[PDB]
Design goal:
Blueprint (H helix, E strand, L loop, with lengths): L4 H12 L3 H17 L2 H12 L8 H7 L2 H10 L3
Helix pairs in contact: 1-4, 2-3
């Protein structure tokens, strides 16, 4: 069974980001977030790069990939 969001994720990131280097930055954060398992560091870096309010919507696709319980905490950490 696929995830579905995966497809939309690629399209979203590409549309919002549109950059090659930027895309690698996000992919790197996730790749490390898996082994590191640190939501604190993830949100931090994601902010420095996705700080642009225009990129905020990107967080939507980020949740799906992120663990369930992690999603809840993701919102608890990410302010507004």
């Amino acid at each position: 069974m696929d995830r579905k969001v995966a497809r939309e994720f690629r399209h979203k990131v590409d549309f919002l980001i549109e950059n090659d280097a930027e895309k690698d930055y996000l992919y790197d954060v996730l790749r490390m977030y898996h082994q590191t398992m640190d939501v604190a560091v993830l949100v931090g870096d994601l902010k420095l790069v996705i700080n642009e309010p225009s990129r905020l919507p990107l967080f939507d696709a980020i949740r799906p990939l992120i663990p369930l319980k992690h999603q809840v905490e993701y919102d608890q950490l990410t302010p507004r």
